[PDB]
C-alpha cells in the first residue's frame, strides 16, 4: 500500500480583520490512506463546532478534506490546526499565520 503524508494549510475564508466574523479553515490534502484526525485549536484548546467536507480525492488518488468553523479573530487569540495520520510521528500542529 502507498502511504502519502498530508499537506496542511490553515487559513481564513476572508482576509482576517478583528471583530468581523469569518471562517477558520484547515485544508488537508495529498494523503493516503484515508483515515485521519484533524482538530482546530483556539489558544491550544480543541474547538467545538468544527465541520468537515465529504471525503474526496485528487487525480493521483490522494485524499483531501476541509475542516472549518465559524470564528471572529482578534489581537489576543492564536489558532492552529492539529493533524494526525499514520505517515506522521505523531500529531502535527500548524499555527495560523494571519499576515501573509
Amino acid at each position: 500500500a502507498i502511504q502519502r503524508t498530508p499537506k496542511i494549510q490553515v487559513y481564513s475564508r476572508h482576509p482576517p480583520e478583528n471583530g468581523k466574523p469569518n471562517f477558520l479553515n484547515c485544508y488537508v490534502s495529498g494523503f493516503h490512506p484515508s483515515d485521519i484526525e484533524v482538530d482546530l485549536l483556539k489558544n491550544g484548546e480543541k474547538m467545538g463546532k468544527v465541520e468537515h467536507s465529504d471525503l474526496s480525492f485528487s487525480k493521483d488518488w490522494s485524499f483531501y478534506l476541509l475542516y472549518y468553523t465559524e470564528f471572529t479573530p482578534n489581537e489576543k487569540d492564536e489558532y492552529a490546526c492539529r493533524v494526525n495520520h499514520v505517515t506522521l510521528s505523531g500529531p502535527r500542529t500548524v499555527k495560523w499565520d494571519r499576515d501573509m
Partner: protein
C-alpha cells in the same frame, strides 16, 4: 469553459472483523460538489450537497441510492477478490477507489468518458478512451479485465457515458446555472515582508476564484522561477471559491525584476503583477 465535467469519486475501505467495508461516494459537476453517500450514516442514502439539487424529487434519490448500494456490494466483493489475488492477509485494511464520469463538449458531444479504479492508492484498471477496451496495471487487473470482458462491462459503461451521463450533466448545468456557468476571476495582490534588511518575501495572492484551475508563476526578468517559488496547493474558501498563493524571497534591490503572472478562465487577459510599494 467549452468543456464541463461530471465525476463520481467512491472510496471503499475494508475493516476486517470490524464490519462490512465503509463506502463513501461524492459527486461533482466541475469543481462543485453536488451529492454524497456515506455507508456509515444513520439512514444511508444519496443526499444533496448543493442547493440547486434540492429540487429533484424523491424518485431521483431512490434510484441514485439503489445504484450506489449496488456498486458498494460489487466493490466489497472486489476487495475480497483483490486480497486473494495479491495473497494478502485477511486482517489488513485495504482501499478500492473508483472514478467515473463524462466531459461534455460545447456542442453537446462526449469529449471523454471515464471509469477507472485504484487499489491501495495505485492505478489498477481503466476504461480506455474508446469506451470498448481496458488498460490493466498488472496480472491481477488483467484477470479483472477478462471477467469484465466476459460480462460486457465496457458496453454497459459506454451506453451510460454517451447517454445518461451527459443528459444528467446537462440538467445539472441548467438547474445550477448561476453557480456552475460562472467564471469568477481571482482578486489578486502582491505583499512584501522583509526577511532581513537586505531581502524580502514577495507573495502573490489569488482569492475568490472559480473554477479551481489557475496558473500562478513568478518570473525574474521574464525567466520562470518555479525552482525558487513556494507555491501552495489550490485550496477551497469553503464558499464555493478557491485560493492560491506563490512566494519568492528576493534581494531588496531586485524586487522590481520580479513579476507574478496569473491566468484564469474568468480573466479577460492574463495578469502581470508586481510589488507596488
Amino acid at each position: 469553459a467549452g468543456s464541463h465535467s461530471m465525476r463520481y469519486f467512491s472510496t471503499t475501505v475494508s475493516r476486517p472483523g470490524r464490519g462490512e467495508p465503509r463506502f463513501i461516494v461524492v459527486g461533482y459537476v466541475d469543481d462543485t460538489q453536488f451529492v454524497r453517500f456515506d455507508s456509515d450514516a444513520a439512514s444511508p442514502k444519496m443526499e444533496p450537497r448543493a442547493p440547486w439539487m434540492e429540487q429533484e424529487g424523491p424518485e431521483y434519490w431512490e434510484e441514485q441510492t439503489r445504484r450506489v448500494k449496488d456498486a458498494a456490494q460489487t466493490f466489497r466483493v472486489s476487495l475480497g477478490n483483490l486480497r486473494g489475488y495479491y495473497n494478502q492477509s485477511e486482517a489488513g485494511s485495504h482501499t478500492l477507489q473508483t472514478m467515473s464520469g463524462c466531459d461534455l463538449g460545447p456542442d453537446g458531444r462526449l469529449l471523454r468518458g471515464y471509469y477507472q479504479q485504484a487499489y491501495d492508492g495505485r492505478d489498477y484498471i481503466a476504461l480506455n478512451e474508446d469506451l470498448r477496451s481496458w488498460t490493466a496495471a498488472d496480472e491481477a487487473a488483467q484477470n479483472t479485465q477478462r471477467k469484465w470482458e466476459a460480462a460486457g462491462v465496457a458496453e454497459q459503461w459506454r451506453a451510460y457515458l454517451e447517454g445518461e451521463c451527459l443528459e444528467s450533466l446537462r440538467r445539472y448545468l441548467e438547474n445550477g446555472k448561476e453557480t456552475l456557468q460562472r467564471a469568477e476571476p481571482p482578486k489578486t495582490h502582491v505583499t512584501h515582508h522583509p526577511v532581513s534588511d537586505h531581502e524580502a518575501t514577495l507573495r502573490c495572492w489569488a482569492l475568490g476564484f472559480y473554477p479551481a484551475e489557475i496558473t500562478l508563476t513568478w518570473q525574474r526578468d521574464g525567466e520562470d522561477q518555479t525552482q525558487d517559488t513556494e507555491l501552495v496547493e489550490t485550496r477551497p474558501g469553503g464558499d464555493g471559491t478557491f485560493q492560491k498563493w506563490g512566494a519568492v524571497v528576493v534581494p531588496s534591490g531586485e524586487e522590481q525584476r520580479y513579476t507574478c503572472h496569473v491566468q484564469h478562465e474568468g480573466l479577460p487577459e492574463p495578469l502581470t503583477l508586481r510589488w507596488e510599494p
